């Protein structure tokens, strides 16, 4: 079967793309209205327009789940209200086959989300920040039993006012070394000048020692873990884990990123089950209102359980993959009720 498959896939894909365009335009306008209150001498209306325009890929990435939900709702509602899904069943096409056809359209949005997160958002966000406001200062980090502090760090391998403190398994001091400038030549060792060490007293004009800081990740410490792309997030978490403890705010971001395609697919499945179930024979306006309510509820629930994952003991995997699994089960049951 291909013609019915193309019909359903094309209708739902066009609905998803139309909802995507509408929601992206609406969020761009809404943020521009919000950004219009911060204009000043060096931040004109044109600058704030470019700031929200460069943030459009991020808004798109954030809309794609709810865009897919509303697109599935509208596309399947157009078919159901026209009594087309009834005659697809009258010939022997299951509910799950139609759901799979809609998931085929949702996979395009999943791939678009992947592409945006990997290659578009990390660049347009940097462009937006450069447009608005126009390397980390006072970088504090721990490497196992050693605590290192640098006042100024550069992505090209420059350090200023290095301070390293060592300890034992019993937490006893060995040497508190301080430097003025530092350079990066190889992993696990940095060249520096004005090398002053305590001893439990020593000085050296120039000598390198072992420290695990790497210039590749220095520009990511300022970036919030949510904003980081998946490749950046995984590389940074690996680097931190190999030398320190990864914060829970990074595990949470990793689990919200690895579970976004599954959340999108589950949301589309819930939309399909609602169209075949409770939202059958309802008007299109009511279907759209319920789709907005479900989108808001899902966004609020995922945000709250992300916040709750940072304060409660269990891993953020439970708090992120929990709602997705529960909504998939609910949608599958509503599809079983036919």
């Amino acid at each position: 079967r291909r013609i019915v498959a193309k019909h359903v896939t094309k209708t739902t894909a066009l609905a998803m793309l139309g909802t995507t365009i509408v929601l992206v335009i609406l969020q761009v306008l809404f943020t521009y209205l919000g950004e219009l209150s911060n204009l000043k001498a060096d931040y004109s209306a044109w600058q704030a327009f470019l700031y929200v325009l460069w943030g459009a890929p991020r808004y798109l990435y954030e809309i794609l789940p709810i865009s897919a939900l509303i697109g599935a709702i509208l596309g399947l509602g157009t078919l159901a209200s026209n009594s087309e899904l009834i005659v697809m069943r009258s010939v022997g096409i299951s509910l799950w086959r139609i759901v799979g056809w809609v998931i085929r359209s949702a996979l395009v949005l999943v791939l678009l989300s992947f592409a945006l997160s990997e290659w578009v958002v990390p660049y347009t966000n940097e462009r937006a920040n450069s447009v608005k406001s126009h390397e980390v200062r006072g970088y504090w980090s721990r490497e196992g039993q050693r605590f290192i502090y640098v006042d100024y760090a550069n992505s090209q391998g420059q350090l200023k006012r290095i301070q390293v403190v060592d300890f034992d398994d019993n937490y006893r001091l060995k040497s508190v070394t301080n430097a003025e400038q530092g350079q990066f030549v190889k992993d696990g060792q940095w060249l520096l000048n004005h090398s002053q060490q305590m001893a439990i007293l020593a000085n050296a004009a120039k000598q390198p020692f072992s420290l695990a800081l790497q210039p590749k990740y220095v520009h990511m410490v300022t970036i919030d873990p949510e904003d980081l792309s998946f490749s950046q997030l995984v590389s940074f978490m690996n680097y931190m884990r190999e030398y320190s403890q990864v914060p829970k705010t990074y595990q949470l971001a990793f689990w919200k990123k690895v579970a976004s395609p599954f959340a999108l697919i589950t949301l589309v499945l819930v939309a399909c089950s609602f169209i075949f179930g409770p939202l059958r024979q309802q008007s299109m306006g009511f279907r759209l209102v319920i789709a907005l309510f479900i989108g808001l509820g899902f966004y609020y629930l995922q945000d709250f359980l992300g916040y709750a994952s940072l304060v409660y003991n269990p891993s953020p995997a439970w708090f992120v993959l929990g709602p997705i699994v529960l909504m998939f089960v609910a949608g599958s049951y509503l599809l079983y009720r036919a």
């Binding site: 209150s37 006072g138 605590f147 006893r172 001091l173 008007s283 916040y307």
Partner: protein, 316 residues
């Protein structure tokens, strides 16, 4: 009997919509506050008083929006189930139905006038003093597990964090005094099984004690002083603000004509944006009057435009 029918229907659906909009709009704010409270930047025990003191602010927007949405829901229902064709077909126009709800619009106008003039300034005063009390948190209060927190001359680390913000584990403190403790309970904090170092002084210990707006002013003070543009803007906002209920009535009467096939909810999304245009225009007008750029007259100007537009559209 028709007036009582409409009033009961509109009151019931408007209360339902107001409860829904309240739940949604301050659930978003409560979730955001809990997110802020998740990093320790806000006490978890006061984020309910924050919502309680911001009830009037959110209700100030919800009451016109709730009244407008309920009015369009009632009128769209009348259109869908053919109760309007027998009301129009008996000599009762849709404008006449809108005029039968003038007493209800006046009751809602009085309620929102109370909100604007008394409850919103009081709630904002309370919330502002509470937030000012919550902005002094520093040091061990903002610590997060497995991270470095810098607050002025203090650098703080915690290896673990309990569900409540007490009983720290694997504590590293920097000034220059270096303090490392296995445990710490909370600024007054008792450190258990810790070591203290000075940058060379070493002092081990078993226990240690470490000791490191015009929007809220009462309308009594705002009745006068119309000369000051900020004071005038706020007072005009409180005076001409409640009249969005009347505009929400004559706009919901205008944009409610819907077909039975289209549905009761067909016209809600296009018209909620039209009403949001009025609210956004009023907020922008407030901002400009606060800069002595527009003048107090811009409030009745915008109110009279959206109306003469709603009235003209309802009489086409």
């Amino acid at each position: 009997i028709i007036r009582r029918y409409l009033v009961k229907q509109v009151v019931s659906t408007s209360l339902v919509v107001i409860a829904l909009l309240t739940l949604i709009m301050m659930g978003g704010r409560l979730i955001k506050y809990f997110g802020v409270a998740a990093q320790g930047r806000l006490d978890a025990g006061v984020l309910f008083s924050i919502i309680g003191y911001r009830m009037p602010e959110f209700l100030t927007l919800i009451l016109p929006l709730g009244f407008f949405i309920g009015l369009m829901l009632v009128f769209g229902r009348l259109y869908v189930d053919h109760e309007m064709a027998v009301l129009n077909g008996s000599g009762i126009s849709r404008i006449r139905l809108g005029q039968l709800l003038i007493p209800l619009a006046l009751v809602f106008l009085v309620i929102q006038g109370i909100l604007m003039l008394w409850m919103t300034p009081w709630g904002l005063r309370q919330f502002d003093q509470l937030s000012s009390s919550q902005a002094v948190r520093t040091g061990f209060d903002l610590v997060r597990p497995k991270e470095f927190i810098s607050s002025g001359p203090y650098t703080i680390y915690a290896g673990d964090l309990s569900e409540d913000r007490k009983n720290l584990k694997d504590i590293f403190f920097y000034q220059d005094v270096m303090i490392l403790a296995k445990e710490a309970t909370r600024n007054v904090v008792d450190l258990i099984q810790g070591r203290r170092y000075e940058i060379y002084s070493q002092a081990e210990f078993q226990r240690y004690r470490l000791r490191l707006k015009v929007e809220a002013l009462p309308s009594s003070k705002l009745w006068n002083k119309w000369n000051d543009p900020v004071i005038a803007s706020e007072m005009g906002w409180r005076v001409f603000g409640p009249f969005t209920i009347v505009i929400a009535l004559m706009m919901a009467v205008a944009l409610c004509e819907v077909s039975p096939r289209q549905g009761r909810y067909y016209r809600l999304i296009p018209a909620i944006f039209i009403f949001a245009s009025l609210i956004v225009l009023l907020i922008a007008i407030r901002t400009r009057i606060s800069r002595d750029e527009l003048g107090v007259w811009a409030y009745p100007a915008a109110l009279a435009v959206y109306g003469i537009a709603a009235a003209l559209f309802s009489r086409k």
